[PDB]
Amino acid sequence: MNMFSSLSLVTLLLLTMPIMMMSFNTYKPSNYPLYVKTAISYAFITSMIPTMMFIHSGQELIISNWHWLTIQTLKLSLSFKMDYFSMMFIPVALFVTWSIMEFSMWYMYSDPNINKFFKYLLLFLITMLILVTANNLFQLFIGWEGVGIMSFLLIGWWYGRADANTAALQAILYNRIGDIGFILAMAWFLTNLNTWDLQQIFMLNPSDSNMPLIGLALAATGKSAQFGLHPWLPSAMEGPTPVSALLHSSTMVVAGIFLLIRFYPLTENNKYIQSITLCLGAITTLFTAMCALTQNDIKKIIAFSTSSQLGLMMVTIGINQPYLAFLHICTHAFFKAMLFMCSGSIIHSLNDEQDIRKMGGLFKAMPFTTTALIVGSLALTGMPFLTGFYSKDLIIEAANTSYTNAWALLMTLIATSFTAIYSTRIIFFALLGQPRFPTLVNINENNPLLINSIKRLLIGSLFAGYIISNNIPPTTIPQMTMPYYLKTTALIVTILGFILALEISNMTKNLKYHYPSNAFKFSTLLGYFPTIMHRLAPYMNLSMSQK
């Protein structure tokens, strides 16, 4: 108990101690970059001690450790919600962060402001952890903005690049829009209900919670980059790759779904939210892949490749799977973030080249890079027993074997195969074929530090996702019984994506001229949603402002 709670709160305060050392003193320069990493390394250990106790005891502890404010009949505190999600989502985030931690200590050697770089990387981590552990909307709101702001600087690290300034505000524009539902939700729980503490919210079990949940639906629309407020998520790839690896691949993007899960007791009864959320992911989960089938940017493609995974997570919640969707969060983060780092290896040896068509001949010229690229893809595509398959097979269970919209299941599998399609298009140019990079060879990855970074993040997907399944205790009645094809439909359509893309990929070798096609451009040009909605809408708001 005491030991469990006490040792748990150290991580949030422990992580902040290096930050307190940046605003004060000048004792030891040139060593902070390692200082932070070891703290996470140490933090991870203190993030695993709660792991043991929680699994054995399942001790969900809400700790109110202050009396901040008090209005008539309200009270705010700097409390934390030590429960399943924090105990199980924190270890993964640090694990990924720990990998990314040492990844960035090498890639950004070209930045004199590297020390500043870490002055914010550690900041975001703090806010994200506070967000998930938050017991109240307000404190939860704070993290909802910290991720919003910490992204602003990290997104726009190179403030000179016009893409950063435009993209950074594009996301901030969207990120703020999502909060409209968030602030609305607080108002409703303050008017109809009377508090922002989840204890009262769940226990009272609202009978008409359409409005508060509708705000939650909007919250995830922009923050998690769902369709309708999606375009910004790819836009983050105009800046540092390590920055994209954590914020927009593993940590910030998970915010949108997280709130719905954290309000699981309320979301169950109202199916109005479920349908639109179920449909919202449906339109997004394919619109991301449908667009992604022909995109030609290594970093953006990964963003779209991440987008579809996120788009499907909403469907997982849309099918009323509270704790099963949670797994998809951790499982996806491992490799995809590693893929960002792997994409870093490609960009490193390429000396600032990113076009997918300017890559190849890397199977043996990039042996280590080739090593982990397939696992993430195979795990991403749903290779059995791998980190991504567990969710992919499990998640498709209820959706295809429980009450769901007819059209909802339609795009559910069409894009599912597309998930593997671009992976083959990627590993093809990335690894298959003879080299196509510029004449001079800058290829070198005999860097021990990165190998440590790749080592740590290569292992987790292979084994950690498998391990994570065992310890977690029962919370649901698994639908182990279903028609064999439905149980194996993923096991049926999975191989189709590789082959179908392989059918598409190899026929392009032949020396035959090309032919334009509208759909080839509709998906390639992002469905024209960004190309249009990011011209007129700025023009409407601004060109019409003067009058």
């Binding site: 050697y109 070209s110 490193h348 000396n351 080249e353 510029p438 004449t439 001079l440 800058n442």
Partner: protein, 88 residues
Amino acid sequence: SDAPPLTLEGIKDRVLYVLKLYDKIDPEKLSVNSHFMKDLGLDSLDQVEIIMAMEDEFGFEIPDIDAEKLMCPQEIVDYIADKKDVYE
């Protein structure tokens, strides 16, 4: 990215070696300062192809206006040396 250094002496053959694979030139007649149109008996349309190879060779675009005047290998070296600020 450790260090991608650049040296004028090392770059010397990089511009010239590009010409060493051309199928419209005798390698031995070619010189460091040889004008392409007259000394090498070439044309602007032929000269366009050489300029393009430098972009695949080194990896950086070339403006249309300044591409034409680079009729001397030294000038091409000057463009590469001067644009990247390489002096030794």
